[PDB]
PDB file of all heavy atoms in Angstrom:
ATOM      1  N   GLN A   4       1.825   7.248   4.689  1.00 39.56           N
ATOM      2  CA  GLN A   4       2.716   8.309   5.161  1.00 39.56           C
ATOM      3  C   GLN A   4       3.765   7.761   6.129  1.00 39.56           C
ATOM      4  O   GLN A   4       3.694   6.603   6.544  1.00 39.56           O
ATOM      5  CB  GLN A   4       1.911   9.416   5.848  1.00 39.56           C
ATOM      6  CG  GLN A   4       0.850  10.057   4.966  1.00 39.56           C
ATOM      7  CD  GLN A   4       0.152  11.224   5.640  1.00 39.56           C
ATOM      8  OE1 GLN A   4      -1.072  11.238   5.771  1.00 39.56           O
ATOM      9  NE2 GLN A   4       0.929  12.210   6.077  1.00 39.56           N
TER      10      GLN A   4
ATOM     11  N   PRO C   1      -7.714   6.044  11.409  1.00  2.00           N
ATOM     12  CA  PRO C   1      -7.781   7.009  12.505  1.00  2.00           C
ATOM     13  C   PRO C   1      -6.791   8.158  12.337  1.00  2.00           C
ATOM     14  O   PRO C   1      -5.988   8.147  11.404  1.00  2.00           O
ATOM     15  CB  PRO C   1      -7.414   6.169  13.732  1.00  2.00           C
ATOM     16  CG  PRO C   1      -7.816   4.782  13.374  1.00  2.00           C
ATOM     17  CD  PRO C   1      -7.593   4.658  11.895  1.00  2.00           C
ATOM     18  N   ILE C   2      -6.860   9.138  13.235  1.00  2.00           N
ATOM     19  CA  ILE C   2      -5.919  10.257  13.243  1.00  2.00           C
ATOM     20  C   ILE C   2      -5.075  10.174  14.511  1.00  2.00           C
ATOM     21  O   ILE C   2      -5.615  10.137  15.619  1.00  2.00           O
ATOM     22  CB  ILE C   2      -6.643  11.622  13.171  1.00  2.00           C
ATOM     23  CG1 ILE C   2      -7.699  11.605  12.044  1.00  2.00           C
ATOM     24  CG2 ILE C   2      -5.628  12.759  13.051  1.00  2.00           C
ATOM     25  CD1 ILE C   2      -7.513  12.612  10.929  1.00  2.00           C
ATOM     26  N   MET C  10      -0.638  15.825  13.538  1.00  2.00           N
ATOM     27  CA  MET C  10      -1.741  14.872  13.428  1.00  2.00           C
ATOM     28  C   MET C  10      -1.841  14.362  11.993  1.00  2.00           C
ATOM     29  O   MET C  10      -2.023  15.150  11.064  1.00  2.00           O
ATOM     30  CB  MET C  10      -3.061  15.529  13.841  1.00  2.00           C
ATOM     31  CG  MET C  10      -3.085  16.051  15.271  1.00  2.00           C
ATOM     32  SD  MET C  10      -3.049  14.742  16.511  1.00  2.00           S
ATOM     33  CE  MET C  10      -4.721  14.111  16.391  1.00  2.00           C
ATOM     34  N   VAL C  11      -1.730  13.045  11.822  1.00  2.00           N
ATOM     35  CA  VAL C  11      -1.731  12.425  10.493  1.00  2.00           C
ATOM     36  C   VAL C  11      -2.680  11.230  10.431  1.00  2.00           C
ATOM     37  O   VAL C  11      -2.899  10.545  11.433  1.00  2.00           O
ATOM     38  CB  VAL C  11      -0.313  11.982  10.066  1.00  2.00           C
ATOM     39  CG1 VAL C  11       0.585  13.196   9.878  1.00  2.00           C
ATOM     40  CG2 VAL C  11       0.297  11.015  11.075  1.00  2.00           C
ATOM     41  N   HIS C  12      -3.232  10.987   9.243  1.00  2.00           N
ATOM     42  CA  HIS C  12      -4.209   9.919   9.038  1.00  2.00           C
ATOM     43  C   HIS C  12      -3.538   8.561   8.839  1.00  2.00           C
ATOM     44  O   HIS C  12      -2.534   8.454   8.133  1.00  2.00           O
ATOM     45  CB  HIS C  12      -5.096  10.233   7.828  1.00  2.00           C
ATOM     46  CG  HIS C  12      -6.112   9.173   7.533  1.00  2.00           C
ATOM     47  ND1 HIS C  12      -5.873   8.138   6.656  1.00  2.00           N
ATOM     48  CD2 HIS C  12      -7.368   8.984   8.005  1.00  2.00           C
ATOM     49  CE1 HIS C  12      -6.938   7.359   6.597  1.00  2.00           C
ATOM     50  NE2 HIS C  12      -7.859   7.850   7.406  1.00  2.00           N
ATOM     51  N   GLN C  13      -4.107   7.532   9.465  1.00  2.00           N
ATOM     52  CA  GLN C  13      -3.663   6.151   9.292  1.00  2.00           C
ATOM     53  C   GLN C  13      -4.845   5.265   8.917  1.00  2.00           C
ATOM     54  O   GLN C  13      -5.985   5.548   9.288  1.00  2.00           O
ATOM     55  CB  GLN C  13      -3.025   5.621  10.579  1.00  2.00           C
ATOM     56  CG  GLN C  13      -1.630   6.156  10.857  1.00  2.00           C
ATOM     57  CD  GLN C  13      -0.943   5.431  12.001  1.00  2.00           C
ATOM     58  OE1 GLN C  13      -1.589   4.772  12.816  1.00  2.00           O
ATOM     59  NE2 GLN C  13       0.379   5.553  12.067  1.00  2.00           N
ATOM     60  N   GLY C  46      -9.876   7.916  18.200  1.00  2.00           N
ATOM     61  CA  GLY C  46      -9.407   8.845  17.175  1.00  2.00           C
ATOM     62  C   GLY C  46      -9.870   8.482  15.775  1.00  2.00           C
ATOM     63  O   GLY C  46      -9.198   8.798  14.791  1.00  2.00           O
ATOM     64  N   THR C  48     -12.194   8.423  12.340  1.00  2.00           N
ATOM     65  CA  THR C  48     -12.945   9.334  11.480  1.00  2.00           C
ATOM     66  C   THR C  48     -14.338   8.760  11.228  1.00  2.00           C
ATOM     67  O   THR C  48     -14.572   7.580  11.492  1.00  2.00           O
ATOM     68  CB  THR C  48     -12.238   9.536  10.124  1.00  2.00           C
ATOM     69  OG1 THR C  48     -12.134   8.280   9.439  1.00  2.00           O
ATOM     70  CG2 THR C  48     -10.845  10.118  10.323  1.00  2.00           C
ATOM     71  N   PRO C  49     -15.273   9.587  10.723  1.00  2.00           N
ATOM     72  CA  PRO C  49     -16.591   9.069  10.339  1.00  2.00           C
ATOM     73  C   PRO C  49     -16.540   7.900   9.348  1.00  2.00           C
ATOM     74  O   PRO C  49     -17.399   7.019   9.395  1.00  2.00           O
ATOM     75  CB  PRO C  49     -17.269  10.281   9.699  1.00  2.00           C
ATOM     76  CG  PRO C  49     -16.646  11.451  10.373  1.00  2.00           C
ATOM     77  CD  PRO C  49     -15.223  11.059  10.653  1.00  2.00           C
ATOM     78  N   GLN C  50     -15.545   7.902   8.463  1.00  2.00           N
ATOM     79  CA  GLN C  50     -15.334   6.798   7.528  1.00  2.00           C
ATOM     80  C   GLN C  50     -14.944   5.521   8.271  1.00  2.00           C
ATOM     81  O   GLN C  50     -15.432   4.436   7.948  1.00  2.00           O
ATOM     82  CB  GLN C  50     -14.247   7.157   6.511  1.00  2.00           C
ATOM     83  CG  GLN C  50     -14.139   6.184   5.346  1.00  2.00           C
ATOM     84  CD  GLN C  50     -12.952   6.471   4.446  1.00  2.00           C
ATOM     85  OE1 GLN C  50     -11.825   6.631   4.916  1.00  2.00           O
ATOM     86  NE2 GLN C  50     -13.198   6.529   3.143  1.00  2.00           N
ATOM     87  N   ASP C  51     -14.060   5.658   9.256  1.00  2.00           N
ATOM     88  CA  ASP C  51     -13.620   4.523  10.069  1.00  2.00           C
ATOM     89  C   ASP C  51     -14.771   3.949  10.896  1.00  2.00           C
ATOM     90  O   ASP C  51     -14.881   2.733  11.051  1.00  2.00           O
ATOM     91  CB  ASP C  51     -12.465   4.928  10.993  1.00  2.00           C
ATOM     92  CG  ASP C  51     -11.197   5.304  10.232  1.00  2.00           C
ATOM     93  OD1 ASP C  51     -10.984   4.798   9.109  1.00  2.00           O
ATOM     94  OD2 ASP C  51     -10.404   6.107  10.767  1.00  2.00           O
ATOM     95  N   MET C  96     -14.518  28.693   7.267  1.00  2.00           N
ATOM     96  CA  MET C  96     -14.662  27.435   6.536  1.00  2.00           C
ATOM     97  C   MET C  96     -16.105  26.936   6.589  1.00  2.00           C
ATOM     98  O   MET C  96     -16.914  27.419   7.387  1.00  2.00           O
ATOM     99  CB  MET C  96     -13.697  26.364   7.069  1.00  2.00           C
ATOM    100  CG  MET C  96     -13.991  25.851   8.472  1.00  2.00           C
ATOM    101  SD  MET C  96     -12.947  24.447   8.909  1.00  2.00           S
ATOM    102  CE  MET C  96     -13.500  24.129  10.582  1.00  2.00           C
ATOM    103  N   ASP C 103     -22.812  15.140   6.708  1.00  2.00           N
ATOM    104  CA  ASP C 103     -21.351  15.240   6.617  1.00  2.00           C
ATOM    105  C   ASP C 103     -20.665  14.621   7.835  1.00  2.00           C
ATOM    106  O   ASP C 103     -19.589  14.032   7.713  1.00  2.00           O
ATOM    107  CB  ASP C 103     -20.912  16.701   6.468  1.00  2.00           C
ATOM    108  CG  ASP C 103     -21.383  17.327   5.167  1.00  2.00           C
ATOM    109  OD1 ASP C 103     -22.246  16.733   4.488  1.00  2.00           O
ATOM    110  OD2 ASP C 103     -20.891  18.422   4.826  1.00  2.00           O
ATOM    111  N   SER C 109     -19.693  13.339   2.655  1.00  2.00           N
ATOM    112  CA  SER C 109     -18.426  14.023   2.919  1.00  2.00           C
ATOM    113  C   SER C 109     -17.242  13.094   2.672  1.00  2.00           C
ATOM    114  O   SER C 109     -17.254  11.938   3.095  1.00  2.00           O
ATOM    115  CB  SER C 109     -18.382  14.550   4.357  1.00  2.00           C
ATOM    116  OG  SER C 109     -18.419  13.491   5.299  1.00  2.00           O
ATOM    117  N   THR C 110     -16.221  13.610   1.994  1.00  2.00           N
ATOM    118  CA  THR C 110     -15.028  12.830   1.675  1.00  2.00           C
ATOM    119  C   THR C 110     -14.107  12.717   2.888  1.00  2.00           C
ATOM    120  O   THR C 110     -14.307  13.395   3.896  1.00  2.00           O
ATOM    121  CB  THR C 110     -14.242  13.458   0.506  1.00  2.00           C
ATOM    122  OG1 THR C 110     -13.839  14.788   0.853  1.00  2.00           O
ATOM    123  CG2 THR C 110     -15.097  13.500  -0.756  1.00  2.00           C
ATOM    124  N   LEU C 111     -13.100  11.854   2.778  1.00  2.00           N
ATOM    125  CA  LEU C 111     -12.102  11.683   3.834  1.00  2.00           C
ATOM    126  C   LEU C 111     -11.264  12.951   4.015  1.00  2.00           C
ATOM    127  O   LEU C 111     -10.877  13.288   5.135  1.00  2.00           O
ATOM    128  CB  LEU C 111     -11.191  10.492   3.513  1.00  2.00           C
ATOM    129  CG  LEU C 111     -10.102  10.142   4.531  1.00  2.00           C
ATOM    130  CD1 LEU C 111     -10.701   9.827   5.893  1.00  2.00           C
ATOM    131  CD2 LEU C 111      -9.271   8.973   4.025  1.00  2.00           C
ATOM    132  N   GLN C 112     -10.986  13.639   2.909  1.00  2.00           N
ATOM    133  CA  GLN C 112     -10.263  14.912   2.931  1.00  2.00           C
ATOM    134  C   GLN C 112     -10.984  15.943   3.799  1.00  2.00           C
ATOM    135  O   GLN C 112     -10.360  16.615   4.620  1.00  2.00           O
ATOM    136  CB  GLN C 112     -10.100  15.444   1.499  1.00  2.00           C
ATOM    137  CG  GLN C 112      -9.449  16.819   1.373  1.00  2.00           C
ATOM    138  CD  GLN C 112      -8.061  16.893   1.985  1.00  2.00           C
ATOM    139  OE1 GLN C 112      -7.662  17.933   2.511  1.00  2.00           O
ATOM    140  NE2 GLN C 112      -7.317  15.793   1.918  1.00  2.00           N
ATOM    141  N   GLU C 113     -12.297  16.054   3.611  1.00  2.00           N
ATOM    142  CA  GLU C 113     -13.116  16.999   4.369  1.00  2.00           C
ATOM    143  C   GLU C 113     -13.187  16.634   5.852  1.00  2.00           C
ATOM    144  O   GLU C 113     -13.145  17.513   6.714  1.00  2.00           O
ATOM    145  CB  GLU C 113     -14.529  17.078   3.779  1.00  2.00           C
ATOM    146  CG  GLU C 113     -14.581  17.720   2.401  1.00  2.00           C
ATOM    147  CD  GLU C 113     -15.986  17.801   1.826  1.00  2.00           C
ATOM    148  OE1 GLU C 113     -16.868  17.032   2.261  1.00  2.00           O
ATOM    149  OE2 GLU C 113     -16.208  18.637   0.926  1.00  2.00           O
ATOM    150  N   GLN C 114     -13.294  15.338   6.139  1.00  2.00           N
ATOM    151  CA  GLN C 114     -13.341  14.848   7.519  1.00  2.00           C
ATOM    152  C   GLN C 114     -12.042  15.137   8.266  1.00  2.00           C
ATOM    153  O   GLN C 114     -12.070  15.569   9.418  1.00  2.00           O
ATOM    154  CB  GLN C 114     -13.641  13.346   7.548  1.00  2.00           C
ATOM    155  CG  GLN C 114     -15.062  12.997   7.132  1.00  2.00           C
ATOM    156  CD  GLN C 114     -15.262  11.513   6.890  1.00  2.00           C
ATOM    157  OE1 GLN C 114     -14.499  10.681   7.380  1.00  2.00           O
ATOM    158  NE2 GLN C 114     -16.300  11.174   6.133  1.00  2.00           N
ATOM    159  N   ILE C 115     -10.909  14.901   7.606  1.00  2.00           N
ATOM    160  CA  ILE C 115      -9.600  15.223   8.180  1.00  2.00           C
ATOM    161  C   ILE C 115      -9.464  16.739   8.355  1.00  2.00           C
ATOM    162  O   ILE C 115      -8.902  17.205   9.348  1.00  2.00           O
ATOM    163  CB  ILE C 115      -8.439  14.683   7.310  1.00  2.00           C
ATOM    164  CG1 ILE C 115      -8.444  13.151   7.296  1.00  2.00           C
ATOM    165  CG2 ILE C 115      -7.094  15.183   7.827  1.00  2.00           C
ATOM    166  CD1 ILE C 115      -7.668  12.543   6.146  1.00  2.00           C
ATOM    167  N   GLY C 116      -9.986  17.495   7.390  1.00  2.00           N
ATOM    168  CA  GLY C 116      -9.974  18.955   7.446  1.00  2.00           C
ATOM    169  C   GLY C 116     -10.624  19.520   8.696  1.00  2.00           C
ATOM    170  O   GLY C 116     -10.032  20.351   9.381  1.00  2.00           O
ATOM    171  N   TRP C 117     -11.839  19.064   8.995  1.00  2.00           N
ATOM    172  CA  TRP C 117     -12.571  19.526  10.180  1.00  2.00           C
ATOM    173  C   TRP C 117     -11.875  19.127  11.482  1.00  2.00           C
ATOM    174  O   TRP C 117     -11.777  19.931  12.411  1.00  2.00           O
ATOM    175  CB  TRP C 117     -14.007  18.983  10.192  1.00  2.00           C
ATOM    176  CG  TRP C 117     -14.949  19.682   9.252  1.00  2.00           C
ATOM    177  CD1 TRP C 117     -15.170  21.027   9.163  1.00  2.00           C
ATOM    178  CD2 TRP C 117     -15.821  19.069   8.296  1.00  2.00           C
ATOM    179  NE1 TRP C 117     -16.112  21.289   8.196  1.00  2.00           N
ATOM    180  CE2 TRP C 117     -16.531  20.104   7.652  1.00  2.00           C
ATOM    181  CE3 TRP C 117     -16.066  17.744   7.915  1.00  2.00           C
ATOM    182  CZ2 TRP C 117     -17.467  19.856   6.645  1.00  2.00           C
ATOM    183  CZ3 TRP C 117     -16.998  17.499   6.915  1.00  2.00           C
ATOM    184  CH2 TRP C 117     -17.687  18.551   6.292  1.00  2.00           C
ATOM    185  N   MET C 118     -11.400  17.885  11.543  1.00  2.00           N
ATOM    186  CA  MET C 118     -10.808  17.337  12.765  1.00  2.00           C
ATOM    187  C   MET C 118      -9.452  17.961  13.105  1.00  2.00           C
ATOM    188  O   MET C 118      -9.129  18.128  14.282  1.00  2.00           O
ATOM    189  CB  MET C 118     -10.675  15.813  12.655  1.00  2.00           C
ATOM    190  CG  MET C 118     -12.015  15.090  12.601  1.00  2.00           C
ATOM    191  SD  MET C 118     -11.905  13.364  12.087  1.00  2.00           S
ATOM    192  CE  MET C 118     -11.093  12.641  13.510  1.00  2.00           C
ATOM    193  N   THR C 119      -8.673  18.311  12.081  1.00  2.00           N
ATOM    194  CA  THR C 119      -7.337  18.889  12.274  1.00  2.00           C
ATOM    195  C   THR C 119      -7.295  20.420  12.141  1.00  2.00           C
ATOM    196  O   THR C 119      -6.212  21.008  12.110  1.00  2.00           O
ATOM    197  CB  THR C 119      -6.324  18.279  11.282  1.00  2.00           C
ATOM    198  OG1 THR C 119      -6.718  18.580   9.938  1.00  2.00           O
ATOM    199  CG2 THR C 119      -6.239  16.770  11.462  1.00  2.00           C
ATOM    200  N   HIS C 120      -8.461  21.063  12.074  1.00  2.00           N
ATOM    201  CA  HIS C 120      -8.533  22.523  11.970  1.00  2.00           C
ATOM    202  C   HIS C 120      -8.236  23.174  13.322  1.00  2.00           C
ATOM    203  O   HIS C 120      -8.222  22.501  14.354  1.00  2.00           O
ATOM    204  CB  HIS C 120      -9.916  22.958  11.470  1.00  2.00           C
ATOM    205  CG  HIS C 120      -9.961  24.360  10.946  1.00  2.00           C
ATOM    206  ND1 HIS C 120     -10.460  25.414  11.682  1.00  2.00           N
ATOM    207  CD2 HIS C 120      -9.559  24.884   9.765  1.00  2.00           C
ATOM    208  CE1 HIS C 120     -10.370  26.524  10.972  1.00  2.00           C
ATOM    209  NE2 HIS C 120      -9.826  26.230   9.805  1.00  2.00           N
ATOM    210  N   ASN C 121      -7.980  24.481  13.302  1.00  2.00           N
ATOM    211  CA  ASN C 121      -7.806  25.268  14.518  1.00  2.00           C
ATOM    212  C   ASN C 121      -8.693  26.521  14.456  1.00  2.00           C
ATOM    213  O   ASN C 121      -8.381  27.445  13.701  1.00  2.00           O
ATOM    214  CB  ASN C 121      -6.333  25.656  14.682  1.00  2.00           C
ATOM    215  CG  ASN C 121      -6.023  26.226  16.057  1.00  2.00           C
ATOM    216  OD1 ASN C 121      -6.555  25.769  17.069  1.00  2.00           O
ATOM    217  ND2 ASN C 121      -5.147  27.224  16.096  1.00  2.00           N
ATOM    218  N   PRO C 123     -10.620  23.090  16.100  1.00  2.00           N
ATOM    219  CA  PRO C 123     -11.063  21.833  15.504  1.00  2.00           C
ATOM    220  C   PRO C 123     -12.556  21.572  15.695  1.00  2.00           C
ATOM    221  O   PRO C 123     -13.123  21.943  16.725  1.00  2.00           O
ATOM    222  CB  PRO C 123     -10.250  20.792  16.272  1.00  2.00           C
ATOM    223  CG  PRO C 123     -10.087  21.389  17.626  1.00  2.00           C
ATOM    224  CD  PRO C 123     -10.027  22.881  17.435  1.00  2.00           C
ATOM    225  N   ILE C 124     -13.173  20.939  14.699  1.00  2.00           N
ATOM    226  CA  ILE C 124     -14.549  20.456  14.801  1.00  2.00           C
ATOM    227  C   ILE C 124     -14.505  18.927  14.758  1.00  2.00           C
ATOM    228  O   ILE C 124     -14.412  18.342  13.677  1.00  2.00           O
ATOM    229  CB  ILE C 124     -15.437  21.003  13.663  1.00  2.00           C
ATOM    230  CG1 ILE C 124     -15.499  22.534  13.733  1.00  2.00           C
ATOM    231  CG2 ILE C 124     -16.839  20.406  13.747  1.00  2.00           C
ATOM    232  CD1 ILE C 124     -16.186  23.184  12.551  1.00  2.00           C
ATOM    233  N   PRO C 125     -14.565  18.275  15.934  1.00  2.00           N
ATOM    234  CA  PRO C 125     -14.352  16.831  16.007  1.00  2.00           C
ATOM    235  C   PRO C 125     -15.564  16.025  15.530  1.00  2.00           C
ATOM    236  O   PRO C 125     -16.323  15.494  16.343  1.00  2.00           O
ATOM    237  CB  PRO C 125     -14.076  16.604  17.495  1.00  2.00           C
ATOM    238  CG  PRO C 125     -14.881  17.655  18.178  1.00  2.00           C
ATOM    239  CD  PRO C 125     -14.901  18.844  17.253  1.00  2.00           C
ATOM    240  N   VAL C 126     -15.727  15.937  14.212  1.00  2.00           N
ATOM    241  CA  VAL C 126     -16.849  15.204  13.611  1.00  2.00           C
ATOM    242  C   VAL C 126     -16.832  13.713  13.963  1.00  2.00           C
ATOM    243  O   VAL C 126     -17.886  13.079  14.040  1.00  2.00           O
ATOM    244  CB  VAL C 126     -16.906  15.368  12.071  1.00  2.00           C
ATOM    245  CG1 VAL C 126     -17.105  16.830  11.693  1.00  2.00           C
ATOM    246  CG2 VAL C 126     -15.662  14.800  11.396  1.00  2.00           C
ATOM    247  N   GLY C 127     -15.636  13.163  14.169  1.00  2.00           N
ATOM    248  CA  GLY C 127     -15.481  11.769  14.576  1.00  2.00           C
ATOM    249  C   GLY C 127     -16.064  11.492  15.950  1.00  2.00           C
ATOM    250  O   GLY C 127     -16.774  10.503  16.137  1.00  2.00           O
TER     251      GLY C 127
END
Side-chain angles (χ1 to χ4, degrees):
Chain A
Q4 302 185 236
Chain C
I2 312 241
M10 300 292 286
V11 294
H12 179 268
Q13 285 190 341
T48 61
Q50 191 187 50
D51 294 332
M96 68 172 179
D103 295 13
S109 64
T110 60
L111 181 59
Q112 176 58 213
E113 292 180 338
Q114 290 168 21
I115 294 161
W117 283 308
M118 294 166 70
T119 62
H120 197 259
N121 192 38
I124 299 172
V126 298

